[model samples]
Target: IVGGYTCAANSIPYQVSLNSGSHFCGGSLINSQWVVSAAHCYKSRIQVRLGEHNIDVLEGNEQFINAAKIITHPNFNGNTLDNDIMLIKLSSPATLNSRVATVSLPRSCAAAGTECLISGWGNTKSSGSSYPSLLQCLKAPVLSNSSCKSSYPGQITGNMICVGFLQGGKDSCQGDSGGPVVCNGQLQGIVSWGYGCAQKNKPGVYTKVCNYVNWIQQTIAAN
Candidate 1:
């Protein structure tokens, strides 16, 4: 996040650190063996560390599970960041403990002005190369459709949700994609896309999780 702070581990139990020897992207555990993340993470081999706090510190409950299979959306467009979400089936079911759990998906959109919390190990600054050793978090307000549309005229789709303050200065950037955009303790959106970090009037965009709940359920049931 552009402006956030190190958060305590297990604060977001379902949060997953998409890693391959290091943090690459953020994800959410939807089940004991299923994880949701961004399709933009196009790698041949991937591993997800659930219940991770500090990458440098090895905790007893932290489970780094191997990706048994990855299923990206058929309509996912990498260039546009559309249908950006994906699912990862772990090789083995994660042993849920005090630090590991799954998030409940939202059944509908979060109300505008709701204070949503976002967390990740993504870059701290827009132009910085360094990433945080601990997870970072920030509270952002869900923006109205008109406000999100102003930033990208005719580009915001129904499957996307706009968030952040009107004045800017907080956003999710690189390595943060596929993270959770939670409101009222429910997963409402997935960190999908946005402009150049935290810019004035450029609200961060996310994949509307509620829109894909049916798809997610169908995918899980069929696969």
Candidate 2:
């Protein structure tokens, strides 16, 4: 993956682009026909490019999928970043290949203290600049549901999950919202919010995928 930050891993799991020439981040393929991403990335139109190693626009190798439909949690509050989950239905199902494959959703609900991975192409520094094309990954331990509630003090609702560094250093920043937080090769959460990237006592918040299972199923079924 090409972006601002580089991970130790040679290849990134996914790729996402916002508004054509704006910010880019990581996104996971949830199903052949559906993509799980953050609601913050929701727009009238956006492109999801699958199976690519670099961020540079590949004319042929890239599979440009259109955002035919977007379904976000009705309770999502942009200000708080709660309930930030959204499903993007592709105009056409992507072909499963070495470069393009769907990630599995968590069969068992992920609980507190679980470990997960967050990947993106966000800014490396707190205040410097963001990478236009490099990708990076960070490890975050899932936080207790109660901890998330206490941190937000009634703001963190049932549809949100929290994870990140307690002392700061590693986290998902701008251009990372609406990306996947994977655990054990399964989709666990969707990156939503945080207290200014990586900050002490302020972990990153995400959309709890398990909580929205019914909504997801119904939405997909309706389509």
Candidate 3:
């Protein structure tokens, strides 16, 4: 997370790390049996780690489990990054505790200007290497679809939302993809894409969670 600070241990319980060999991307624990992430973060074998704060340390609160199944949005477009969401079913249900819990899905779209949090173990620098061992978080405001469209031109879509400052500085970075964009304690977005981390006039784009609530429920229930 660019221009952010370390998060308190397990401060965000729903925050999770998607790991193949190491921390590849961040995810959110929506339920004991399922986690939500960006479709672009997909890998052959993913190990979801819940209750994790320090990516380098073994913190006893951590629960490492394999992904039993992986489901990406059927309409996902790799080129445009539209509908870039995915669901990961844990091999076994997670044991929820104070340090591990689920995040509620948003019932409505986040209004423009709503302050939201973007947290993960992604890079902190605008460019190059500066990955943090501890989780990092940044408070960013949601930009209106009109503004977002202006920033990305024809690239912006209704399935995507923009967050961060147009002047640059704070934003979610490369490894943050698939992380949660929490607003008012609800999961509203998923870190998806941007031209670069914290670049001028380019805010981080996210998968609009409000547009896919039905799909999420249906997929979870059907599978």
Candidate 4:
């Protein structure tokens, strides 16, 4: 991601990398058999790698699994980024360990003014070259819908969450889609889209997890 720092190894144990051949996007392990990401970042044959921080070296904590099924939100809007979330059902369930764990999802939306984190290996700058090896993280507060509306105007939607600095210089970029937006140690959002990486007055938009808790539960049960 843009204006981010290298993350500690497996510090966020739930963080996962979705790969086709190389990195496609970031995802979060929400359960032993389930991973959550953005629908727009979909890859038909995704190989998920979890419990590792660096991609170049194995940390002895990694678990690589093929996706048995992929489910995207039926109402996902590719153009507007509405409901831009998806789930990857692993071919088999993962075993929990110190270095691999599941993330907690939020129960409510619009946790405005709350400071949260976004982590991924997107780009160091807007439209820049990708950073496929190192995971990056940055902390920014969730902006209120009113404040976000000022920035995005008619584009803001209830299914979306805005988080970043009004002055800019910290945000997610390309390759970071489908990643986690963590708040208060809970999985609050998924990195969905943004105008440009860390631009002035423009904040990163995320898929609001709270608004889709029922959908997630139902999807998991049905799948």
Candidate 5:
């Protein structure tokens, strides 16, 4: 995340790394076997690394699990980035510990101005890439749906939420897609996309997790 601080060790137990050889996206462990991420991060042979603090370090607390199945929202529109959420069913149930646990789903949409966190191992710069080894987190506030629409007219949808500073500073960037945007200790958003990192007037866009909570639970129950 841009303009963020390294998360305290094991402070974000729900954070997981979506990897295909290396960290490509960030995800949240929502249950023993289900992980939530952005549909755009889809790739073959994706692996979920749970309980990870530093991507470069071995940290024995890590759980390397493969994806048993990946289910992207059937209505996901790649061009407009609507309904851009996905579920990754782990090959095996993760053994929860102090270093690993599930994040609760939001009961409702977060209100505008609600302070939330965006965490990941994504780029720290807007221009060139500079991914961090340790998980980074930035405190961002949710923008009103009206404000979000004004920032990206005709692009913002009900299934999407915007978070960040209009003045530009903190945000989630490349390699951070599919990461969790936690508000009040609940998963409220999923890192989806943004214009160019933390550009002025261009806040980071995220999948509105509350809108898809039912889809997530139904998918998990069925599959």
Candidate 6:
């Protein structure tokens, strides 16, 4: 999913438009009632657009849904961007359309070294601008936990996962935050952060959706 990115950097995939007319970062639907995204995507009000392929609002055919509520992880810390996961509850169920289809969250994800796919309309280069399209996807491999810990030290945790190429020029960038990092067609992670866009030594960081599975279910049930 994709949207415009301004002050907040990126917009949510659920189509939640901010009061300032800037698009917030978020994820796509994995279910009719639940749309995955990052907690940082939350704002006063959010509008989700589905089936569209461009952020310009006129490039692709789509539908819009207003968010009724936002459910962010309790442990999220904006400073470090840890636990940066969240959910958006659409005011009503989204209708099935040609370009709109929900992704499935993983039940039991693959171990380290697994290959995954990530997509978004974020910055192509670290300091450059974001793509003006609806979305763009790329392939990446999951880094081992030990490797992640050794490389980032003190940053890797059970709830976080890493992916991307260490060779540089291939990675998730700024506006890509809060989008899906899918593995085996299952939603495994949400793009979070990294040292820089396509940095040689730093791989992209993502919030492990698997670790927050229980919290997600509970939050949805309670609300």
Cα-based lDDT for every prediction = 0.86, 0.71, 0.93, 0.88, 0.92, 0.71
lDDT of 2 at 197: 71
What's model 3's lDDT at 123?
Answer: 87
lDDT of 5 by residue, 1-223 (tens): 9999999999999999998988999999999999999999989789999999999989789999999999999999989999999899999999999999999999988889999988999999987888899999899899998878999988888888899899988888999999999999899999998899999999999999988878888899899
Model 6 TM-score, all chains together: 0.86
In order, how many clashes per candidate? Answer: 0, 8, 0, 0, 1, 16
Better model by TM-score: candidate 2 vs candidate 4:
4
Cand. 4 TM to true fold = 0.96
Say which candidate scores most in lDDT. 3
Candidate 6 — worst ten consecutive residues by lDDT sum? 1-10
Better structure of 1 and 5 per lDDT: 5
Q: Give one digit per residue, the lDDT tens place, for model 6 in 85-130.
A: 8888889988765456777778986688888777766776555565
Off by over 4 Å in 2: 1-5, 8-10, 24-26, 57-60
Worst 10 residues of 4 by lDDT: 125-134
Expressed as tens digits, the lDDT of each residue in 1-223 for candidate 3 is: 9999888889999999999889999999998999999999989799999999888989799999999999999999999999999999999999999999999999899889999989999988876878889999899999988889999989988799999999999899999999999999999999999998898999999999999999989999998
Q: How accurate locally is residue 72 in candidate 3, as Cα lDDT from 0 to 100?
A: 93
Candidate 5 global CA lDDT score: 0.92
lDDT of 4: 0.88
Candidate 2 RMSD to the correct structure: 2.9
lDDT of 1 by residue, 172-212 (tens): 88889889988997898888888778888888899988888
- TM-score per candidate, chains pooled: 0.96, 0.87, 0.99, 0.96, 0.98, 0.86
